[PDB]
Structure 1
Amino acid sequence: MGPAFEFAVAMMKRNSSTVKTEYGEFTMLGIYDRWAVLPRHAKPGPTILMNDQEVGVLDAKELVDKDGTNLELTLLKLNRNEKFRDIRGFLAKEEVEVNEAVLAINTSKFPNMYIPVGQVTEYGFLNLGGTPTKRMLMYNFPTRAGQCGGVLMSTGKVLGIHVGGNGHQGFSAALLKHYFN
């Protein structure tokens, strides 16, 4: 748990930002170059607020699998000169399972907050608020609204982005290496 916490804190400092769309305030993880990722429900428009500063969105891709099934991630390309620290080496080729994970949230509602969620298991298929979704990771913890966009991490691993919760169970979309490039 401790090493996952130390990893998470470092990763958030280097790669995370707080973002506002017309649909809410979200934690945003920058991945490489000007590409970042948001939970699909963030529904980013032509401009976003990133750390309170207006930023143009050049492109947004709502990820689906080979059979059109929702993955609940949106990738976005930002109109900005600074490049994200390349973290693609921390992204797995397939859904990660770990014994000890932390979920990191960074918004106005949850400024630099970290939650131990314990074991992460590949859940896979889920009907997510009425939408069939795949590649879900599941973990047990008391889930609250505003946590959407949180970054799920263990030591040396970025596993996914928190996209939903129900009572005492949360779900992340797996953040896979091949989604980038």
Structure 2
Amino acid sequence: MGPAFEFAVAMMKRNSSTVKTEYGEFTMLGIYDRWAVLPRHAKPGPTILMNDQEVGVLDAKELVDKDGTNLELTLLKLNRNEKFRDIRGFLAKEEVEVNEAVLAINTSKFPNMYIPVGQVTEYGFLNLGGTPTKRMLMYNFPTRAGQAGGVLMSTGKVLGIHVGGNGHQGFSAALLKHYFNDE
């Protein structure tokens, strides 16, 4: 298969899981150690269902930029023995544009789905659900319910996390390297 799909299969196999909260079912990406990322709307409580197993949440941080502006991502630390593969070397300093990317989703509704989305562009500012958000990535692709959390990727690059769309376009929160320096 294509080198990006080869990369995407490894990423979902080693670093993704299916997560259920009070607000629905999400693809979840582990970054390193016990730190993982979710869309902000997942709003995890004291515990989450991770591959249908109850996993305690030690700490959860909703990310904002220097401006206080929403980034639409939540970092949570998981109370589990297992460590995640350290994929921070696959994360960029700043936003990345690629001519072709893959969107990978792992939920009971979209199992093992790797969707080619083509051009990804820096979109910047966006009003999601009445909330101003920054650092959004755009890709022309019809988006449906249950895709939030999908991992947007290119060979050797994890670009961001799917967080919404408008029926003809998709939007990802960019996944920057310095978000994972310490917290």
Q: TM-score range by the shorter chain?
A: over 0.9
TM (norm. structure 2) is: 0.97
**Quick check: 1:121–1:138 contact (8 Å CA) kept in 2?**
yes
The Cα offsets for residues 8-34 of structure 1, whole Å up to 9 and x where unpaired, read as: 111111110000111111000000000
1:133 deviates by 0.3
* 1:53-93 Cα shifts (integer Å, max 9, x gaps): 00000000000011110000000000011100100000101
Q: CA separation in 1, counterparts of 2:99 and 2:85?
A: 27
**Aligned positions of 1:98-109 closer than 5 A:** 98-109=98-109
How big is each residue's C-alpha offset from its partner over 1:106-140, in whole Å with a ceiling of 9 and x where there is no partner? 01111110111101000010111111000000000
Distance in 2 (CA, whole Å) between partners of 1:101 and 1:130 is 28
**Distance of 2:166 and 2:5 partners within structure 1:** 24
Deviates more, 1:2-11 or 1:21-30: 2-11
Distance 1:46 1:106 in 2: 23
Q: Which moved more, 1:3-12 or 1:33-42?
A: 3-12
Query: What secondary structure sits across from 1:94 in the alignment?
Result: coil
Structure 2: segments with no counterpart, 5+ residues: none
Cα shift at 1:144 = 0.9
Q: Deviations over 1:121-177 (max 9, x none)?
A: 000101111110000000001211110000000111000000001111000000111
Give the corresponding residue for 1:172: 172
Separation in 1, partners of 2:41, 2:149: 9
Percent sequence identity is 99
Q: Is the 8 A contact 1:137 1:173 kept in 2?
A: yes
Query: SS in structure 2 opposite 1:76?
Result: strand
Is residue 4–residue 100 contact of structure 1 (8 Å, CA) maintained in 2? Answer: no
Partner of 1:6: helix, strand, or coil? helix
What is the root-mean-square deviation of aligned Cα atoms in Å? Answer: 0.9
Distance in 2 separating the partners of 1:99 and 1:87: 22
Q: Which runs of 5+ in 1 are unaligned?
A: none
Q: Encode CA deviations 1:27-55: one digit per residue, 9 max, x unaligned.
A: 00000000000000000110000011000
Kindly tell me the number of residue pairs found equivalent between the two proteins: 181
- How far 1:4 sits from its partner (Å)? 1.3
